[PDB]
Structure 1
Amino acid sequence: SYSIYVYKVLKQVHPDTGISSKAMGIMNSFVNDIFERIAGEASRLAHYNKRSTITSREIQTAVRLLLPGELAKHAVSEGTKAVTKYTSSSRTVRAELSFSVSQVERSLREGHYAQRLSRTAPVYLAAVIEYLTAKVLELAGNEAQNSGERNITPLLLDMVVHNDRLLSTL
């Protein structure tokens, strides 16, 4: 499960907001869907040319190949930040994210998505997922505060993921 990273991301966009237990399952489902989609698409890219490696740029092209492209912009912007900020220098920490780089890369390779990956590829992918996770939790947490509630309920989640131009694409 990825539930710890979601909660940790929720604490950053909204320090004093909680989340119902199946609203969280909903968040775990979203993470795994969006991970499967991007990581499969970079897998195909990798074998579209006959490159063995899924690298940051296969992820990036997958990103611009899946997200609505104002959203993709911020996502690729976020994944590029995590990469350059990881080079300058731990592991996850150097990338300045809460979604574990090591665990994301371990999910990538137990999916056999390609031959091998750059160590800069799970950082990019954890950055992207952390960003969309933070967007969903950000807006939802806001609609909760707008309605005077301390917890993200599942129905708030869905009226937020729908009822938003880009996020409804996902």
Structure 2
Amino acid sequence: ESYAIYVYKVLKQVHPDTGISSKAMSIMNSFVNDVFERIAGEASRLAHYNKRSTITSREIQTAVRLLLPGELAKHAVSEGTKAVTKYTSAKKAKTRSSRAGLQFPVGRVHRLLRKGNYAERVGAGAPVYLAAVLEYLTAEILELAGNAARDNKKTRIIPRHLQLAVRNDEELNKLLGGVT
């Protein structure tokens, strides 16, 4: 699965004038995919303890607290909770983008959770929460990688900028250092 269009949208928010090379985008895609897979796998395991074979935002949140190190978990939980609150708000938004305040599309995350057969059903809040978590991590990595590119006197993020940015951040290194 390719998140490239959404990675690119997030990049334009955090570093409007910075590009990203094809190989750096591939690494970004692998990071998002790896985090999705591990959150979904933990959430699926957690769902067995409930009476209903359903992935809800509660299992996503618990999975995020297990998987994300240190303050990454605190901020991801804040982002996922805020997105679910906004998405379920009584005042309806007029567009999908305005409903959750996100760049990552809820429907794509929903389809990926359903495709993985993580449970019999996927609750309406779970893909919103997970999309917000993936967006938060993507924004964090791209912010740091774009800083590394600028310090390297480059106008595009290349793989060594991503590798340096992840390695030099203790929490991101724990989360991502095993991704190949």
TM over 0.5: yes
Deviations 1:48-86 (A, max 9, x none): 334311100100000001011311000101111111111
1:52–1:114 contact (8 Å) kept in structure 2: yes
Structure 1 letter corresponding to 2:15: H
- 1:140 is aligned to 145
Give me the whole-angstrom Cα distance separating, in 2, the residues matched to 1:130 and 1:3. 12
- 1:11 is aligned to 12
CA positional deviation for 1:149: 1.3
What SS class does the counterpart of residue 41 from structure 2 fall into? helix
CA positional deviation for 1:168: 0.2
Deviations 1:13-56 (A, max 9, x none): 11110001011000000011000000110000001334311100
What SS class does the counterpart of residue 48 from structure 1 fall into? coil
| Percent pairwise identity | 75
What SS class does the counterpart of residue 40 from structure 2 fall into? helix
Match of 1:107 among 109, 112, 123: 112
Structure 2 letter corresponding to 1:62: A
What SS class does the counterpart of residue 10 from structure 1 fall into? helix
* Residues matched between the structures, number: 170
Residues 24 and 167 from structure 1, CA distance in 2 versus in 1: closer, same or farther, beyond 3 angstroms? same
Structure 1 letter corresponding to 2:132: A
Deviations 1:74-105 (A, max 9, x none): 01011111111111233354101011100000
1:40-51 correspondence to structure 2 within 5 Å: 40-51=41-52
Give me the whole-angstrom Cα distance separating, in 1, the residues matched to 2:16 and 2:148. 15
2:148–2:164 contact (8 Å) kept in structure 1: no
1:1-170 correspondence to structure 2 within 5 Å: 1-88=2-89, 89=92, 90-170=95-175
CA positional deviation for 1:148: 2.1
List, as ranges, runs of 4+ consecutive aligned residues in structure 1 with deviation greater than 4 Å. none
TM-score by length of 1: 0.96
Give me the whole-angstrom Cα distance separating, in 1, the residues matched to 2:47 and 2:96. 24
CA positional deviation for 1:117: 1.4
Unaligned regions of 5+ residues in structure 2, if any?
176-180
What SS class does the counterpart of residue 106 from structure 1 fall into? helix
Give me the whole-angstrom Cα distance separating, in 1, the residues matched to 2:133 and 2:123. 16
1:92–1:123 contact (8 Å) kept in structure 2: no
Unaligned regions of 5+ residues in structure 1, if any?
none
TM-score by length of 2: 0.91
Residues 54 and 92 from structure 1, CA distance in 2 versus in 1: closer, same or farther, beyond 3 angstroms? farther
